[PDB]
Scaffold this active site. Structure first.
Site, PDB file in Angstrom:
ATOM      1  N   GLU A  35      -4.687 -10.121   1.287  1.00 13.17           N
ATOM      2  CA  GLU A  35      -5.044  -9.980   2.752  1.00 13.17           C
ATOM      3  C   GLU A  35      -6.652  -9.916   2.697  1.00 13.17           C
ATOM      4  OE1 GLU A  35      -4.703  -6.694   6.323  1.00 13.17           O
ATOM      5  OE2 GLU A  35      -3.667  -6.266   4.543  1.00 13.17           O
ATOM      6  N   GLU A  75       0.810  -0.996  -0.002  1.00 13.09           N
ATOM      7  CA  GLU A  75      -0.049   0.091   0.028  1.00 13.09           C
ATOM      8  C   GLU A  75       0.779   1.424   0.097  1.00 13.09           C
ATOM      9  OE1 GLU A  75      -3.272   0.032   2.771  1.00 13.09           O
ATOM     10  OE2 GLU A  75      -3.389  -1.888   2.744  1.00 13.09           O
TER      11      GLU A  75
END
Lengths: 457, 463
Positions: A351, A170
């Site tokens: 995830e 990210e």
């Protein structure tokens, strides 16, 4: 068969949330080793004992047994990160730490020995505290060089041991967690949007540079980005809300558009002008970004969000968990389709999971375990939606369940909130046996993997 | 300024909705000469005097005068279709009709005389009757052939007179209107979804083929697809409604995806399987579709729509949007929806967009003003257009690339739907009525002068 025979089933961790052995074998301090309270907590001048990540779950030593349990579920893939500081302790060393490299040779060797393809995050929130302290982290362009040196070292070393790579976990999390993500040690209220976005710029250019380098090293490598998937829904059909929802989604889309399409999207300009953000490009940057783009996009998914133009609403149609989070499985189908419609490249869900307060207790068979049927339910539902997305023709490489073995959390640095299919006996206070125990979800997940999903129906 | 210097400002018609002269100068029958009640209506066996299209507004003759009015507005672009039956009256002729070619030669010549670039829809619901009856339209692969000859003739003839081409007006419109858009002779209960989609496939292949040809003829041609824009919104944040909304938009996106991206989209496999659709590809089809895709996407926009996974829960709607105003005629008005759709299209495709149909239908009353001039005071059309163009401006600032804007039916024309003149889109009133009465005299509506100020300020008078 609904799931492709080549589907990668598995689990995901980050190094600092399991390994431990923070001072061993030449490992330098990371930013995590100063984060006893986690991403949301302050930092300590030096590491302290209340920090659970010093020991972790002791994966650094125990990986062989743990990996045997992964093999027991049938993982054909396992995601983790190569910890940057075990390789370059200060980060500026002319030469790599060899013990550090050898540890990962061993890890990947055990994995492959059990039929498990590693998936490696190059930088997952653990920057050398030296780089962070000295340069203030990614705010400084110099970071690119350091990261380059790091990446080149490991791509080159594992070039035949690891096919799937991820540049950053990210890039944009630098917005809400400058220190934890970008290693930016400057006080949050002293950071202008300009410095934040400049930092993310440096991350993205580095991502591209490393992608290039990757392809020169081995052409069979797959280089993915990693992004936070959060589909947004309008509170009402009022077109003002629908447009507010659109603008909300662009904040996120801005970064994946750069990873995938190789340039700042058309709307960026407006946003920047309104926010006083003017990116500073080095002469090489545009071509780097443009010519080297990700082969695939990976993402974390937890929840959706509901938006309004009204001067973050709670969606009345969604269930909640015991933790008090809103559950949205159909949101996973939705965001899968949205990403695939936009980008037309393979997707990887790296995830996903349900955090809960699981208690270890004796079952009727006298085995010590966790009755986690809430997590079985959660995973079932989400994977049914994954299967719907596969039928819609979305290209999905695989699924790695988050914290497949209980790990220290990122936000709070605690073990209390457990995502694992495998319970680890250690507690927030640091105490415990460190024993591993199968949760009830361990068996169920096993069956989904061995049936390649067929058991889901 | 905010609008780019090269922005194209103008108005649009379809040849059959204006020209009249249905039988003149060698012209063959189109599907439209037998559609006196329009596309929603039923065909006759021969043209009939009650068909308003036979005489149209007589643009065929008065085209010079009308164009004078256009230039008075300062149009730098004007969109219309080349009527197919004026070139190939039957469509299977070995040689083209010279009278038609010369006609459009003089048309484009007047346009250029005033500084107006033509924008040419190659096929706009005009399919020659001979072909429609004989082949049953696009259900037959041969149509590709007939379309290609036709297209190649005009591209070749107009290569120095026409820069901007549209292959088709809404290929998917074949779904609702087999006969009108597709020229498909077969009745409704006899057409399966396999047939309609196959016809559409022929259209897409043809579109590609014609793009290839166009590129060979003139490398400066801009060729584009024409599509219906309908942004959908969920009635509620329920993710089920959000998914429903997504599914609905895929119905429209399918075609834009083939046009722009060059192959059937991933969700099509599931949709076709579930609907019993299996597309027969000719061996060369896929590479044609893939290698020749459009230079730009144009669309029509009127309204948004609202969706729900469980509509019967509303007991009305479909689905009325609680938040939008409605036109006197009864359509809902959604200017922001234009910004939303411009953005959705650009986010997906990343190619220049062109708004080639937009406007407000109303029943306009011609009356004398205080100055004694006969006009229409349409402040409602001025407001509709103002709001929509301000949203166009927002999209432009969003960084969307927009080639231009053409007000639909910029001079009152025969509606495609019902083939009627009472529902008027124009900045220019034409006195003719559903019966066929009137001078066919033209009058500037109040909106005329306004749109003139807009075009001549290049949008700056919007603010």
């Amino acid at each position: 068969t609904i799931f492709p025979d080549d589907f990668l089933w598995g689990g995901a961790v980050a190094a600092n949330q399991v390994e431990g052995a923070y001072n061993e074998d030449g490992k330098g301090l990371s930013v995590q080793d100063v984060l006893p309270k986690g991403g949301l907590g302050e930092a300590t001048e030096n590491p302290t004992e209340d920090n659970l990540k010093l020991i972790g779950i002791d994966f650094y030593h125990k990986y062989k047994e743990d990996i045997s349990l992964f093999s027991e579920m049938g993982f054909n893939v396992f995601r983790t990160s190569i910890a940057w500081s075990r390789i370059f302790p200060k980060g500026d060393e002319e030469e790599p730490n060899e013990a550090g490299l050898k540890y990962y040779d061993e890890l990947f060797d055990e994995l492959h020995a059990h039929g498990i393809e590693p998936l490696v995050t190059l930088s997952h929130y653990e920057t050398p505290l030296y780089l962070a302290r000295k340069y203030h982290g990614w705010v400084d362009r110099r970071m690119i060089h350091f990261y380059e040196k790091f990446a080149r070292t490991v791509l080159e070393r594992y070039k035949d041991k690891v096919k799937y790579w991820l540049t950053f976990n990210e890039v944009n999390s630098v917005l809400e967690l400058p220190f934890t993500s970008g290693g930016i040690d400057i006080p949050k209220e002293n950071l202008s949007k300009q410095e934040l976005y400049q930092a993310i710029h440096h991350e993205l250019v580095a991502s591209s540079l490393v992608t290039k380098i990757a392809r020169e090293i081995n052409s069979e490598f797959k280089v993915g980005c990693m992004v936070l998937a959060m589909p947004a829904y309008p509170m009402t059909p009022n077109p003002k809300d629908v447009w507010a929802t659109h603008e909300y989604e662009n904040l996120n889309y801005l970064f994946s558009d750069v990873h995938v399409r190789g340039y700042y999207p058309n709307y960026a300009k407006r946003y920047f002008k309104e926010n006083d953000i003017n990116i500073e490009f080095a002469a090489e940057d545009a071509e780097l970004l443009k010519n080297y783009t990700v082969d695939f996009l990976s993402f974390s998914y937890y929840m959706s969000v509901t938006q309004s133009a009204l001067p973050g609403l709670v969606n009345p149609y969604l269930e909640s968990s015991e933790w008090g989070w809103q559950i949205d499985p159909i949101g996973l189908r939705i965001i899968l389709n949205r990403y695939y419609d936009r980008y037309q490249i393979p997707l990887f869900i790296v995830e996903n999971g349900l955090g809960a307060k699981d208690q270890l207790i004796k079952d009727e068979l006298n085995n010590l375990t966790v009755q986690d049927d809430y997590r079985i339910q959660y995973m079932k539902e989400h994977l049914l939606q994954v299967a719907e997305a596969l039928q819609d023709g979305v290209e999905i490489m695989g699924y790695t369940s988050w914290g497949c073995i209980d790990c220290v959390s990122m936000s709070t640095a605690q073990l209390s909130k457990r995502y694992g299919l495998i319970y680890v006996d250690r507690n927030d206070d640091g105490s415990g046996t460190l024993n591993r125990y199968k949760k009830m979800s361990f068996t169920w997940y096993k069956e989904v993997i061995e049936s390649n999903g067929e058991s889901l129906f």
